Design a protein around this ligand. Structure first.
Ligand code: HEM
Ligand SMILES: Clc1ccc(-c2cnc[nH]2)cc1
Length: 465
């Protein structure tokens, strides 16, 4: 049936000569200009199909959902996962882990705190910590990585860490350094010649080393959980997984074993810590660049929530402006630019082309979030993209920051609740400022690869009264 159009490759080097030195995303966007919304490019010797624009992505991930439900690989972390854990698994193993992960977080019995309550509690701890800074200028990177890591810790380990805990800070350091390395230029070259470059020194080794040190901490927590498990009262995600292992003792095809336990927990930290945190850091940078918008969010908080009680998730339905602002922070932040690689699960017929089973497919989410066919002046921040004439929230088919289809972000619910409660609880309690004039605020990513990493910046949180 034939593959989608694309630059003729050279053996070994593939399409290296037709790439853009800026990175994989620019390379993909440049090729889209020449070959259309659906093309083939060779990363090293591997052929991959690229889908660009809202329409093409929706046709694949939604209209042929099952076919495009396969998961590809990211070379610098594949040595860690190797097909285990809920993110990088395929087939029955993925189906089983996803179903269990959704159900285990979608509800944690009674007597325990809901996910919304754990986030409100973390937002309260955050407010207390920021009050201690007395409004001094700071870089919010560490605290924003802390609050989102703490939500996953609460869910998986059954508790949060104090912001000044040495264990926590070390773990935080390992993770953050890894995300920066993972979307660095080197990791993107590694994506092309891993088969060859895997044999040499480099950042891919430091990434591996850091993630294994985190897996070691995960393993020791699993042992502590095992040693104190009370079947009558599971405490968190690990206890629930351990109880399922007991339930499946006689099932030789169960996927609930050790490797999927450690790597599913790593998956939830990997995914649950990084993107929500960078979205929040990018959102506050935009709020410094658009003080008028920040002021309107604070006015809506005052009208709907007031200044005494904490924001609750059900306030969001009565706060369309703030909700539109968060949508727009996600849309312009474009935190996972070329998506997380998929693969087709069978030879697939797509737009008159044939995509062979297991071929890697990149749904370039950035090209939908910035799709001119759906968003006027896509490169400019405007909450109005999500608001109708009456100020009510409006949907846009191009808005797919969590992707779409069978692989749609498993943590979407948790992430949206974290964005709404952290953004509103911070702005209800603090006004923000920085020495940089709004006009001079640069939104350009410090690094752009599988993740977009926002630039560092200074900000102050002044307690309100
Ligand atoms: C603003 C925050 C977040 C954004 C924009 C985001 C978005 C994404 C995207 C674009 C994908 C790939 C979907 C695909 O394969 O097509 C993904 C997958 C995933 N995300 Fe997130 N994510 C966020 C937060 C979270 C959180 C908080 C968790 C965990 C609690 C999480 C868990 C996962 C997992 C486990 C997958 C793989 C799902 C599967 O393969 O079935 N994410 N996310
Ligand atoms: Cl390689 C990779 C995989 C998954 C994510 C992710 C999912 N949800 C948030 N982040 C990011 C990068």
């Amino acid at each position: 049936g034939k593959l989608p159009p694309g630059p003729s490759p050279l053996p070994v080097l593939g399409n290296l000569l037709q790439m853009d030195r800026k990175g994989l995303l620019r390379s993909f966007l440049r090729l889209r200009e020449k070959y259309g919304d659906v093309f083939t490019v060779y990363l090293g010797s591997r052929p991959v199909v690229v889908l660009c624009g809202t329409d093409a992505i929706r046709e694949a991930l939604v209209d042929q959902a099952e076919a495009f439900s396969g998961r590809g690989k990211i070379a610098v972390v594949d040595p860690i996962f190797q097909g285990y854990g809920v993110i990088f698994a395929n087939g029955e193993r993925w189906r089983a882990l996803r179903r269990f992960s959704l159900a285990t977080m979608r509800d944690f019995g009674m007597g325990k705190r809901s996910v919304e309550e754990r986030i409100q509690e973390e937002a309260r701890c955050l407010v207390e910590e920021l009050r201690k800074s007395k409004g001094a200028l700071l870089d919010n990177t560490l605290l924003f990585h802390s609050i989102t890591s703490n939500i996953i810790c609460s869910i998986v380990f059954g508790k949060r860490f104090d912001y000044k805990d040495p264990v926590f800070l070390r773990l935080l350091d390992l993770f953050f350094q890894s995300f920066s390395l993972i979307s660095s230029f080197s990791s993107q070259v590694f994506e092309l010649f891993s088969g060859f470059l895997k044999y040499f020194p480099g950042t891919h080794r430091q990434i591996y080393r850091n993630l294994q040190e985190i897996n070691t901490f995960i393993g020791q927590s699993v042992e502590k959980h095992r040693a104190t498990l009370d079947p009558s009262n599971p405490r968190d995600f690990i206890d629930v997984y351990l109880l399922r292992m007991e339930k499946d003792k006689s099932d030789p095809s169960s996927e609930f074993h050790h490797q999927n336990l450690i790597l599913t927990v790593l998956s939830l930290f990997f995914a649950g810590t990084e993107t929500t945190s960078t979205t929040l850091r990018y959102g506050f940078l935009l709020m410094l660049k658009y003080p008028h918008v920040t002021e309107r969010v604070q006015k809506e908080i005052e009208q709907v929530i007031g200044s005494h009680r904490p924001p609750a998730l059900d306030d969001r339905a009565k706060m369309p402006y703030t909700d539109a602002v968060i949508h727009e922070i996600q849309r312009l932040g474009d935190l996972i630019p070329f998506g997380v690689p998929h693969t087709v699960t069978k030879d697939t017929q797509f737009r008159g082309y044939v995509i062979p089973k297991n071929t890697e497919v990149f749904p370039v989410l950035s090209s939908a979030l910035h799709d001119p066919r759906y968003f006027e002046t896509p490169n400019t921040f405007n909450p109005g993209h999500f608001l109708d004439a009456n100020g009510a929230l409006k949907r846009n088919e191009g808005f797919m920051p969590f992707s779409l289809g069978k692989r749609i972000c498993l943590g979407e619910g948790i992430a949206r609740t974290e964005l709404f409660l952290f953004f509103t609880t911070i702005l209800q309690n603090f006004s923000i400022a920085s020495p940089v004039p709004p006009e001079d605020i640069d939104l350009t990513p410090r690094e752009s690869g599988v993740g977009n990493v926002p630039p560092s910046y200074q900000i102050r949180f002044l307690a309100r009264h």
